[PDB]
Amino acid sequence: AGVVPNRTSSTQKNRVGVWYGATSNDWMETNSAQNVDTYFIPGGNRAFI
Amino acid sequence: AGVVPNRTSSTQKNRVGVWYGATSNDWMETNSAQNVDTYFIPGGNRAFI
């Protein structure tokens, strides 16, 4: 889209938001949970998408 | 709050929405999954809260 932050009034970093639709965290249930490490929650929770 | 559906303009059944904040599926992860049955998805998916 040719969008570079802070290039224009509408592309200022304080005027950009992100919405994502997710309904599963299978990674946490199955793959990441076979060994819980320091990045379990940051890397598995849907909040971080 | 004394909210009876359909008894006033602002409480008509089609004018009421539900918003919920959830961030876990522990039942699905551990308890409901020990024996998957007919109500696994309807009973463990956050969409049904």
Binding site: A1, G2, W27, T30, N31, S32, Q34 | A33, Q34, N35
Partner: peptide, 30 residues
């Protein structure tokens, strides 16, 4: 005017945590 140029040439690599030993079929057994 903005053209449709080729996407970034990412240096992709495989990062996977394989699900092993079929433990999902024994959820509750000793």
């Amino acid at each position: 005017k903005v053209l449709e140029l080729p996407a970034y040439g990412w240096a992709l690599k495989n990062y996977w945590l394989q699900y092993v030993n079929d433990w999902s079929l024994r959820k509750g057994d000793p």
